[PDB]
């Protein structure tokens, strides 16, 4: 499960995978508790929408979702696709994810105003248009 | 104090001031409690750094600081200065904050990829280079 996911996104820490997995479990548990609130509770609609909007802002949900959609759409992979080298590859800035890891590690890459040299940096939706070369 | 902060920064509700004031008190209480952990406690060091990094990323802190600086540098006004109208005025994009409020509410302003029409929106450090006309 992991080694495949870690393979397709060129993740070398087994620990990165376990953090993303716990976050998926966190979101699941949070949606379950929200769904167990009284449906007459205005807190439930509001905090369900807070969680949805947050996952949009992270780019973890790329499509309009309901709370029931979260089991399908919220996966370790959806988080992995947010890592800076995978983003770079999708933007065509690097031929391969492995080349993007090297570009990032060697200091060639900037997101917004910041030099990022950590390939585990997750690119939010606000930032995904602002990946640039330092050169 | 509430009335004067609102006037300086053209805030039209009384509640944004209290939101910012509680946040300033959250930061002070958090910094006091961190200082009560042992100086050698790695948790304290990690969480002091995270807190400093967060206030830098918000632009609330504009200069390299330490936890002992938080008492002074973290004010309601330092938060107010992050509101989109104030940021625009400081960038010279509007002659006045009131002008900026209008540009914003009328849909003329984008921050990063998003149209922002709420003058209470806070511009993080990441976003402040990316306020553009529509």
């Amino acid at each position: 499960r992991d080694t495949q996911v870690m393979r397709t996104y060129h993740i070398q820490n087994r620990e990165d995978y376990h953090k993303y997995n716990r976050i998926c479990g966190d979101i699941r548990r949070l949606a379950n508790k929200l769904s167990l609130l009284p449906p007459t509770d205005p807190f439930r609609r509001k905090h369900e929408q807070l969680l949805l909007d947050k996952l949009y802002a992270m780019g973890v949900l790329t499509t309009k979702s309901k709370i029931s959609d979260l089991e399908n759409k919220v996966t370790v992979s959806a988080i992995c696709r947010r890592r800076l080298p995978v983003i770079m590859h999708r933007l065509k800035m690097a031929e391969t994810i492995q080349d993007a890891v090297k570009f990032i590690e060697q200091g060639h890459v900037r997101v917004g105003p910041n030099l990022i040299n950590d390939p585990a940096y997750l690119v939010t939706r606000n930032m995904e248009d602002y990946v640039t070369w330092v050169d | 104090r509430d009335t004067q902060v609102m006037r300086t920064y053209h805030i039209q509700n009384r509640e944004d001031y209290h939101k910012y004031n509680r946040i300033c008190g959250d930061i002070r209480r958090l910094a006091n409690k961190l200082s009560l952990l042992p100086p050698t406690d790695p948790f304290r060091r990690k969480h002091e750094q995270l807190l400093l990094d967060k206030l830098y990323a918000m632009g609330v802190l504009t200069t390299k600081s330490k936890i002992s600086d938080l008492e002074n540098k973290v004010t309601v006004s330092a938060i107010c200065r992050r509101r989109l109208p104030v940021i625009m005025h400081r960038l010279k994009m509007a002659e006045t904050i009131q002008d900026a409020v209008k540009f914003i509410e009328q849909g003329h302003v984008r921050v990063g990829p998003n149209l922002i029409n709420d003058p209470a929106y806070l511009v993080t450090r990441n976003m402040e280079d990316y306020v553009t006309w529509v």
Partner: peptide, 27 residues
């Protein structure tokens, strides 16, 4: 009472989630 406790539990879990994602997308 029970409703406030249910709300507080959700607020702590969501804040913790916001915190975890924030650490991953910040320098």
């Amino acid at each position: 009472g029970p409703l406030q406790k249910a709300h507080s539990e959700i607020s702590e879990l969501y804040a913790n989630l916001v915190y975890k994602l924030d650490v991953l997308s910040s320098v």
